[PDB]
UniProtKB/Swiss-Prot annotation, chain A:
Keywords in alphabetical order: DNA replication, Host nucleus
Subcellular location(s) per record: Host nucleus
GO biological process: one example: DNA replication
GO CC annotation: host cell nucleus
Assembly and oligomerization: Associates with the primase and the helicase to form the helicase-primase complex. Interacts with the origin-binding protein. Interacts with the polymerase catalytic subunit.
Its job: Component of the helicase/primase complex. Unwinds the DNA at the replication forks and generates single-stranded DNA for both leading and lagging strand synthesis. The primase synthesizes short RNA primers on the lagging strand that the polymerase presumably elongates using dNTPs. The primase-associated factor has no known catalytic activity in the complex and may serve to facilitate the formation of the replisome by directly interacting with the origin-binding protein and the polymerase.
Main location: host cell
Name the record gives this protein: DNA helicase/primase complex-associated protein
Domain of life of the native organism: Viruses
Phenotypic consequence of N467D: In strain: Nonneuroinvasive mutant HF10
Effect of A471V: In strain: Nonneuroinvasive mutant HF10
From Swiss-Prot, chain B:
Subcellular location: Host nucleus
Oligomer status and interactors: Associates with the helicase and the primase-associated factor to form the helicase-primase factor.
Role summary: Essential component of the helicase/primase complex. Unwinds the DNA at the replication forks and generates single-stranded DNA for both leading and lagging strand synthesis. The primase initiates primer synthesis and thereby produces large amount of short RNA primers on the lagging strand that the polymerase elongates using dNTPs.
Species annotation: Human herpesvirus 1 (strain 17) (HHV-1)
Domain of life: Viruses
Disulfide bonds, paired cysteine numbers: none
Protein name: DNA primase
Family, as annotated: Belongs to the herpesviridae DNA primase family.
Amino acid sequence: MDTADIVWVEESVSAITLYAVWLPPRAREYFHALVYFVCRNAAGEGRARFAEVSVTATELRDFYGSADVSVQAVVAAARAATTPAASPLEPLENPTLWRALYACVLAALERQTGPVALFAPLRIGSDPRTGLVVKVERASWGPPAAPRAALLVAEANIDIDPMALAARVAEHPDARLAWARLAAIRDTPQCASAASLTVNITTGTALFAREYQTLAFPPIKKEGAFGDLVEVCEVGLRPRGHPQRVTARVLLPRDYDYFVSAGEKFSAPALVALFRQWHTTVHAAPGALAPVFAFLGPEFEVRGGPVPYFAVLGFPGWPTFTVPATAESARDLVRGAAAAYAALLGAWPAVGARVVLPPRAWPGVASAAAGCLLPAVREAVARWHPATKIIQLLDPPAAVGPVWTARFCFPGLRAQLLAALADLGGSGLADPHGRTGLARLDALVVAAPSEPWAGAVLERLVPDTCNACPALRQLLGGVMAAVCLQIEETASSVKFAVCGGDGGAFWGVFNVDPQDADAASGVIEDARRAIETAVGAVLRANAVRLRHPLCLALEGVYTHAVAWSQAGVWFWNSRDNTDHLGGFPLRGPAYTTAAGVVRDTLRRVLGLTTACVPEEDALTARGLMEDACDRLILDAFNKRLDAEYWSVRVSPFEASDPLPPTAFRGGALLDAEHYWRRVVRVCPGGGESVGVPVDLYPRPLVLPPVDCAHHLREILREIELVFTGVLAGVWGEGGKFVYPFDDKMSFLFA
Amino acid sequence: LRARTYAPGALTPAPAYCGAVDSATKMMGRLADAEKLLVPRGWPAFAPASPGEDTAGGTPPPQTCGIVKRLLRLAATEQQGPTPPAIAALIRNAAV
């Protein structure tokens, strides 16, 4: 505490990792943790520093989100993870515990020592007698150094009996195969020592190549020295939670900061085995502690996740970024990844929604925020129900034309609403240090307009927070309903008539002479400005303040509109041949040709509609429609031998066919199966119609004739769903559209 | 026209024959061997059943009308690109 012995230096931090987790001598209420920073100076010189924090049990329970956890379990898992020779995949048993642990330790470190940030200058003050960082402050001393990268390529060959995979899959009928491979490897660790491996690392100064026939013996091919990539350091500490002196052995990288790996073929087991060998090799001589060995990813859950990553929580000490290749914007992708890593402190996406606020504090904040609002808004919030209709007076099939139609949008309203509402309710927080979390969120919003990565992060993040607590859902629904009602009321006096939408984006019709073109461009702008001002005033009325001022955008002007359902709609402009289509499913490469055909046929029919002809026109229209379908089928004949063209995508929450046993013999192709599964259908005999997972077999394939009638019928149903509505709406008919597939062109594929 | 009729060179005189001729039983053996060869790349299995087996199930008909159907389906399968068709696994030649 004394300031007469504190030594101050100016440096920068590039990574924070977890080193040790233990329990003090005589206490069962809390535990202690020891963390390790890798800092750099103003010209580029690595150094290692250590800090220690203490965590209670109430905070741990709050971050977990339930009351079925204990400090004993945390300590037991942390102690077990220290030995990777026998237990290398500890976080696969229970991931939520590790997520809560990481989040709580980070928050405690931020609150106790002080404010910290990555890739920014800082002033660090330490105690010379004990050797632990004691204070951190933010200052400015110049243009800090620039990050550096290093390319990595690894390949491993592991062998596992297909019977184990089959049994594990049978245990859980809807599990992904990467998790099955990981679990099988976990059961018998020794199989990770007999694998054959190859590694190639390219840096800006050297190169490192290795080829092991078996990971337990000397390399068969070698190039480079280990004493160049990294440096081994020994430090002597003296924490307050131990009775005797302690020593720590760490690795310090040389001339780089993080690894970058292409996403063409990424496999976790290769990295796990390589790092396991390094951990075993380095920590052999007795006389020092050992770090933890933990990792995280989307393959540690039974059903996977939609966004891939690879999070490192302990050994060795630096992050790894997996970026899909074959994209002309690879540099942009890597820049976005680095920016996201720096901005959010590295927790995202590992922790999830705990980077903002703990999941056991939301209800109080939501209640306090809602308690103020305004009487009418409170009444609206109390009665909110998902399936309700307020403003959007149209219906199933209906056509408008020729008039001036317009489409407007508010870009990014939910995130702004959440930020403002959380700020309003923050007065109810039972802590003065949680605001930092909210602060982070605010920054993201201000960066959304000019940075795509911020927009993607917010889009992925808001649904998680909403799903955490339904009170947020209700509050947002009520506020949005009030906004929509005000919008409609104001728009009812500028020659505007709302025809569709929900409030975030909508479309409507204007009342003006349909001939003059130089006078129809002076009424849309006035309406847009008036609506913007009215919405701003209504929001400001209910003591709600926004960082970014509202801005409403016009997305096009058309003349014809057709609506055939509650989510499908077609707009057309009869002066430049521009059009827009919304509400068509797309689950494969053969669902785009149908969209193109639909667009062309609709354009032709609506162009012919301006012939001012009696009911005969309808008959003519029908003819055209049929013709289009005919051509489509004929065109599909030439692509009858393509397997990937006809394959369709399936998600974990739907029902699919059983997995054929042979698929379990694929090997290393089962690692990249996070979320989707692609399936095709073939006929090997008579009427069998068996399924095939395309992506689990080596290329090229050898299959019987494809099944084209099934897929063609599936597409044709959706094709007709729109033509029927167009016919019933434009001409007020009563006959459905039906195409005789079974009696006209079914002989081609028989 | 090309995908629904014999190949141009099938019905043309040649010095000798280049096919597979056999009895019924040895034909079953060769068919099983070829199917085993082809399975590892996508071809679905067969899973047959015969009287006197441990599982009665359906399709009691033994290997009497079950050979012609399989032979015909194998012979009517076309080829894509430079990869020889499937029948080459039974005739044992890469020029059919």
